[PDB]
Design a protein around this nucleic acid. Structure first.
Lengths: 136, 80, 83, 78
RNA sequence: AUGGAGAGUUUGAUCCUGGCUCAGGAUGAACGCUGGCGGCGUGCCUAAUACAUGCAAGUCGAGCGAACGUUAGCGGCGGACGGGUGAGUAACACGUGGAUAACCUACCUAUAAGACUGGGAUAACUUCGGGAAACCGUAGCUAAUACCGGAUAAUAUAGUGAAAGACACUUAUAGAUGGAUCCGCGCUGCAUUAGCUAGUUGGUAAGGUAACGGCUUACCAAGGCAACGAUGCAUAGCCGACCUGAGAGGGUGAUCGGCCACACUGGAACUGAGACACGGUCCAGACUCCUACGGGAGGCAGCAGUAGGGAAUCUUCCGCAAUGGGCGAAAGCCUGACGGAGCAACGCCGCGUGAGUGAUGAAGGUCUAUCGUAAAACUCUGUUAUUAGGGAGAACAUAUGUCACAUCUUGACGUACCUAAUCAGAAAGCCACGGCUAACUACGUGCCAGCAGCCGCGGUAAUACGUAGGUGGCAAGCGUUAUCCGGAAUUAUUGGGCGUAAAGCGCGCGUAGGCGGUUUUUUAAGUCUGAUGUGAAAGCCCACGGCUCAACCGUGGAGGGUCAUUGGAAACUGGAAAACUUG
């Protein structure tokens, strides 16, 4: 803890990397290179539906979504809830980041969000997987 | 508003008064606080005189009357 | 070339202004070096005319004359016509 | 869109500067060129340009301190 | 110095830790929801996009060549224009002091030399003409306070231009304008870039910019460098702003820019009361293009709008009236500078959509007394809504009579404060629904779907889930969107380990220098601190006054932060003479 060589030679900070690096980004075609944006809002347009089986910690069954973002790369999602949207090819409002217990996926759906409304079997949630005009 | 008594020492020289004087000062950095002493180089000139092998002098900030050189003052300590 | 200016931070509820010596080719808002104060031309806020224009009235023989319909404020005074 | 008069006053400005600067181009082709060559050009052939460059430099564009450098290298050049 | 209590983190366990997820928000922060209205404000932040055009500083003269100052464009203006920004540079582009032994100038204001003498040409009327037009040819022109001899005009210690209405001209000269000729600290990162550029060192040029001078050139020697960042070199504005710390300030500097890089393009003969010029002037380029294909030259980094990219990403509603730039001895303009706004529940507020309430009150919705003092059906406020008159500010002007200045000259929004009688014109709906992040119980559910901000839940009592009457926060507000702040003491300028997390020399070696005996020290610099300069701030360590309080303005006592003077204390890092010696 000696200060001579401290202006001769400095120190570092910690070492951390931020969250969702292949997110918060809008891929170019005119100038071909991405934008570092951290946008509030964004879209999702669909390529498949997707589902993998081996689930230990829950040990029930539920699928997810394989939705591609701009212009030739693998981007993957998951539908956290009791609502099955047996759909695809949508145009939505993204939710950024991952919910607990799925590795590598960081992209999601807001309730409603211009494509569908949601799993309409919900009426008590009034704020989960599709819930609009709910008597409070 | 007058002109200072900037001083220093000498290092080397070339043909027909490529003269100089050394510049230095007491001061420190804003970050990690040590009394490390520091310098930068200047540009004075003579006929051929204020030059290498001992020219502890003064210098000025005036009209240079010079190429890119800047000083007219020599106010000495001694010679070798 | 010299003209009058004013300051701006946040109030009104009565036509207010200020006294200063800015440039000619510019808007009502201008930079002020020797702040003399402000002016209240709302005929209601009398406690706001604390303008001590000491370097603004020295343009009489330097370069100044009532312009932009501002002679009304100088109409009450009379520190001119020295030539 | 008021170029309807100053599309072209740049050009009377041109003419009324250039023809006189050229009539100086003949005023540096006599005296200053021949205050060396031994010619008669140090009397009334220096002194025409007194009132000639005076026809020039009573306006803001013609040389001002360069007027004091063109008159100190022709009249004081003895 | 108005001073630092975060959710849970270890193996199995007290214990020294270990930082994560994470918090709350604040973001030009909004998306589904929800869409009582607004005070005022900002939104090509999608793409410094290609274009539905024009759009923009503009018109005129008792001083001047058409008509009963109209009709010129000489002359003046403009042209570098308001506005648009943060495409482009590590740069005096940027905030402040500043040698001027690197600077001057008409616009703001008074003037001052005088107002003498001049010729006469050019715009229009076009005078005369070929031909898709209009592009171009003949070509006297008629004047102009002017294109314009000549006198001395001032710096020889010997430089010229003035052609005034009426009881307004050109110069010796100025205070000034952007600036700045420039000085200084302002003036970031990349060690996967040191044997240093030939000009590296600086003197020496005919030259010249209001401006010294390797700035091109003028003459010669480099080791000038030198292991210290030569140099390369990547974003390339700064600075009143905002969240903010206890304080050092610490970062982003977008509404808000006072200063500068920048207008299709490379230039550009030009020029200016201020230059290579955003609707100029020409000639090279590739663009949607206009043209008897004279060949036109235009692009909204200036309001719109079009195909758009679009988390949202706006009114072509109006036209000078809030300031006059410019033209004018004058009455007058253009505003697209500045203005008038669908307003987006974007900021948050001004408050309004139920009352006197009510005996526990029912026909009971998780539970099986709970939110039930639920209810009804009675009354209370104008404040939303039927109208109405709606004139809030404020002083404008040769001849009016003789730069202090002024009347017979200032209502699109010019109707606001709208008490106003006033019915009853509801304030969408809240999350998880246990315990922490604050939450209440369960039928659906038998692992079938499935709960879940770090902790964390359903396999036959989800005090989580599907759903259902709400208590903790709420009523213009519900879950989410992600940015740095004290918090993060996971920078350590205040607040950094050495054997052990995640950490100590192969060492004989060892340049630069960070440090670097005792005592007196010659120093009289500096710190001790300070006379001074006390040169302004709108507001400062504060508070307050105008305002239906909130959108919009102000007294500045805190001196403007060694700024215009260098100090006395030698106790010392500091021009630095030695002695001590056993270390």
């Amino acid at each position: 803890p000696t200060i001579n060589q401290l202006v001769r030679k400095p120190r570092q900070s910690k070492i951390k990397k931020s969250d969702s690096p292949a997110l918060n980004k809008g891929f170019n075609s005119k100038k071909k290179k991405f934008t570092d944006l951290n946008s509030p809002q964004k879209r999702g347009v669909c390529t498949r539906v997707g589902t993998m089986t081996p689930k230990k910690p829950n040990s029930a069954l539920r699928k997810y979504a394989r939705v591609r973002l701009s212009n030739n790369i693998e981007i993957n999602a998951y539908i956290p809830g009791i609502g099955h949207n047996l759909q695809e090819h949508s145009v939505v409002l993204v939710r950024g980041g991952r919910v607990k217990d799925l590795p590598g996926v960081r992209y999601h759906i807001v309730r409603g969000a211009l494509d569908t409304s949601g799993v309409d079997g919900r009426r008590q949630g009034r704020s989960l997987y599709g819930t609009k005009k709910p008597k409070n | 508003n007058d002109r200072k008594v900037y001083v220093g020492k000498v290092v080397s020289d070339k043909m027909d008064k490529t003269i100089t004087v050394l510049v230095e000062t007491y001061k420190t950095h804003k970050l990690y606080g040590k009394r490390v002493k520091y310098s930068k180089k200047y540009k004075t000139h003579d006929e051929n005189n204020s030059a290498k092998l001992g020219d502890i002098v003064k210098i000025q900030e005036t009209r240079p009357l010079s190429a890119t050189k800047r000083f007219r003052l020599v106010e000495i300590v001694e010679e070798s | 070339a010299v003209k009058i200016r004013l300051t701006r931070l946040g109030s009104k509820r009565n036509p207010f202004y200020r006294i200063v010596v800015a440039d000619a080719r510019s808007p009502r808002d201008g930079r002020i070096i020797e702040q003399i104060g402000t002016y209240n031309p709302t005929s209601a806020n009398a406690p706001e005319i604390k303008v001590d224009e000491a370097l603004a009235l020295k343009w009489l023989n330097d370069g100044a004359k009532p312009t932009d319909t501002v002679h009304n404020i100088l109409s009450k005074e009379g520190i001119m016509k020295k030539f | 869109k008021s170029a309807i008069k100053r599309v072209k006053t740049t050009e009377k400005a041109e003419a009324r500067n250039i023809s006189q600067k050229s009539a100086m181009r003949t005023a540096v082709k006599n005296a200053k060129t021949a205050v060396s060559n031994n010619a008669d050009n140090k009397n009334e052939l220096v002194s025409l340009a007194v009132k000639l460059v005076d026809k020039a430099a009573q306006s803001n564009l013609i040389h001002s301190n360069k007027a004091d450098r063109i008159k100190s290298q022709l009249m004081t050049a003895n």
